Design a protein around this ligand. Structure first.
Ligand SMILES: NC(=O)c1ccc[n+]([C@@H]2O[C@H](COP(=O)([O-])OP(=O)(O)OC[C@H]3O[C@@H](n4cnc5c(N)ncnc54)[C@H](OP(=O)(O)O)[C@@H]3O)[C@@H](O)[C@H]2O)c1
Ligand SMILES: NC(=O)c1ccc[n+]([C@@H]2O[C@H](COP(=O)([O-])OP(=O)(O)OC[C@H]3O[C@@H](n4cnc5c(N)ncnc54)[C@H](OP(=O)(O)O)[C@@H]3O)[C@@H](O)[C@H]2O)c1
Lengths: 324, 324
């Protein structure tokens, strides 16, 4: 329910950082298709509009736009998952970005900010499933600690702004996102868009599909379009400082193998599918509970997985040249 | 052993931020009394020399001084423990200060940085005693989370600089510090310098001593002069990125009651001593292990507690007008 029974409307200016990305582009579509309400001006920006690692440029963007609300998606994110690690660069640039954005929002007097966290913030050693309370219950995985701790500190900023200044800054925690306008780069991208590109190359080359690792790791996937809907809802209706996980349930986890099968079917691929165990498996699970989301939106129906994959595969094929 | 059997010496420029405080002033005395080695220039600064929350001012200080080594003591610390809490201010100003300092040190090519952490960084729910491994094993106490998390992130920066850039940035974790040049303010200061001031007022007023709470909480105290010696050693000899606790052992913990008795004796006070149970007790224990320190310096002898208190009491009495 992204409409309203209200007869009157407030003038809202909604700045969306990282608007040109996977998540941001999904919000644009959902809004452009009529999820936008009267009085709401949606302003989507990218790094062209301002480098958010720079305080002066961020301040200037916020002075120009004067947002009443902020959805904060921007992060320095590539190339995470590459061979050599750059934990200081990722820690320092992301903390600067997050501080610039939250504090400019504070300065302009924004009513609400919703930032985007990641399952990489959760503790390495933890019970399962993981919920929003457990975010700080032990250190994150060492592989990319810099990035993880920078995200965790968004929660700490939100809590501090609330406690001292009364601001309603909060955050959402998506699981693994996929959809149109993803980064489909095979070396640097996530597994699901990477698989879509890999299968596309297997048809164009007539080769076989080589999946990295065992195919055993389990993941919760969420369609960018489903996430966008939940994001707009959170912006309008969710008022806890504590973050909220946006994800399908623990029972709808699927293995990398099952995910590759969904792509193979969707792209109508008949070549061999092999699992290269020489490349390392990542974490086996990062299973998140959506209990909280279910208390707020019990009747919300996610797009079925195979359909969401087909649409994404269809988009990639139809926009191959312009895609990432 | 703060001397050396070496015959040759390297030119070292050692910048000490927060040099005008309790810890900093102890380092000055220890150095001025001959702990300084040939080739070492010690440069002690305070906020007069540069406001370390300001990047430009910090960068300029570092350009002028060109430190090879940094002992980083500066923190925005007052008024912590006051009634109303300001978690955003403490989080944000301290993170800025720490980032400015560590990153300027990195920029000038400093060989080593040693920062100062606090027992407030440790998890609220933890086993005892606490060691340097447990620093991130659960959230800190909510009272002053902003300050605590800002300190914790020094460890994360150190680890990141090491991993990506090869820098030797590390930290020390003192327990409760006391000595000359402390802040003896009764509303805002720590318990031990607060008690010294309270007893001084009880003599000058002819009143009785009112200690807040039961006197049951147990604390590890460390004389600023002992800490200074260990700090110089750490700078010269300690090369782990992981921090190191500087403290007397678990067996030398003393209660607030025992601490007040040490002051009463030292200041030769004969009035009544009452324990106002109406005011709340803080945390019962924050017990830290010095096992690691003992592996490096087994024969290091701490100043006996009652002597350290007497000297501090003596200093306060002799410098009452000029003291804080
Ligand atoms: N995709 C996932 O699986 C996933 C899961 C959980 C959370 N998230 C979160 O979702 C958010 C966005 O991810 P995404 O999946 O949409 O990534 P994406 O498609 O790579 O988009 C990233 C966005 O960040 C912007 N950006 C990066 N550096 C910037 C800078 N210095 N200044 C200004 N803007 C900058 C980019 O602008 P340009 O394109 O102009 O550089 C881009 O619009 C991130 O906060 C991420 O942590 C993603
Ligand atoms: N005392 C303890 O019990 C204890 C225990 C554990 C850890 N520590 C750590 O020890 C370090 C020093 O503690 P302390 O007890 O010596 O504190 P202190 O006596 O209050 O001194 C703090 C020092 O920091 C400087 N400072 C504060 N804000 C500054 C700014 N914006 N720019 C530049 N300098 C600034 C002060 O200079 P000005 O006076 O010129 O402002 C002062 O020299 C801190 O990191 C603290 O967390 C202390």
């Amino acid at each position: 329910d992204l409409g309203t029974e209200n007869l009157y409307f407030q003038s809202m200016r909604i700045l969306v950082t990282g608007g040109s990305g996977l998540v941001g582009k999904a919000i644009q579509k959902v809004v452009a298709d009529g999820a936008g309400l009267p009085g709401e001006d949606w302003v989507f920006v990218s790094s062209k509009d301002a480098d958010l690692t720079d305080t002066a440029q961020t301040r200037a963007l916020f002075e120009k736009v004067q947002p009443t609300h902020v959805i904060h998606l921007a992060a320095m994110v590539g190339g995470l998952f590459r061979n050599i690690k750059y934990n200081l660069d990722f820690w320092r640039k992301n903390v600067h970005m997050n501080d610039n954005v939250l504090h400019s929002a504070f300065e302009v007097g924004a009513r609400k900010v919703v930032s985007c966290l990641s399952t990489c913030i959760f503790p390495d050693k933890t019970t399962y499933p993981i919920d929003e309370t457990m975010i700080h219950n032990g250190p994150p995985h060492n592989s990319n600690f810099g990035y993880s701790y920078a995200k965790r500190m968004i929660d700490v900023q939100n809590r501090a702004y609330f406690q001292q200044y009364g601001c309603t800054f909060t955050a959402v925690i998506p699981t693994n996102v996929f959809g149109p306008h993803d980064n489909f780069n095979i070396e640097d991208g996530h597994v699901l868009p990477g698989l879509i590109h890999k299968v596309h190359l297997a048809k164009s080359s007539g080769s076989a599909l080589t999946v990295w690792g065992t195919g055993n790791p389990r993941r919760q996937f969420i369609y960018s379009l489903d996430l966008a809907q939940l994001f707009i809802w959170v912006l309008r209706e969710y008022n806890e400082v504590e973050p909220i996980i946006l994800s399908v349930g623990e029972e709808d986890e699927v293995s990398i193998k099952e995910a590759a099968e969904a792509v193979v079917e969707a792209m109508d691929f008949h070549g061999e599918v092999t699992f290269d165990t020489t490349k390392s498996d990542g974490q086996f699970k990062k299973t998140a509970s959506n209990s909280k989301l279910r208390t707020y939106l019990p009747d919300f129906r996610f797009t079925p997985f195979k359909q969401a994959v087909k649409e994404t595969c269809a988009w990639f094929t139809d926009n191959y040249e312009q895609a990432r």
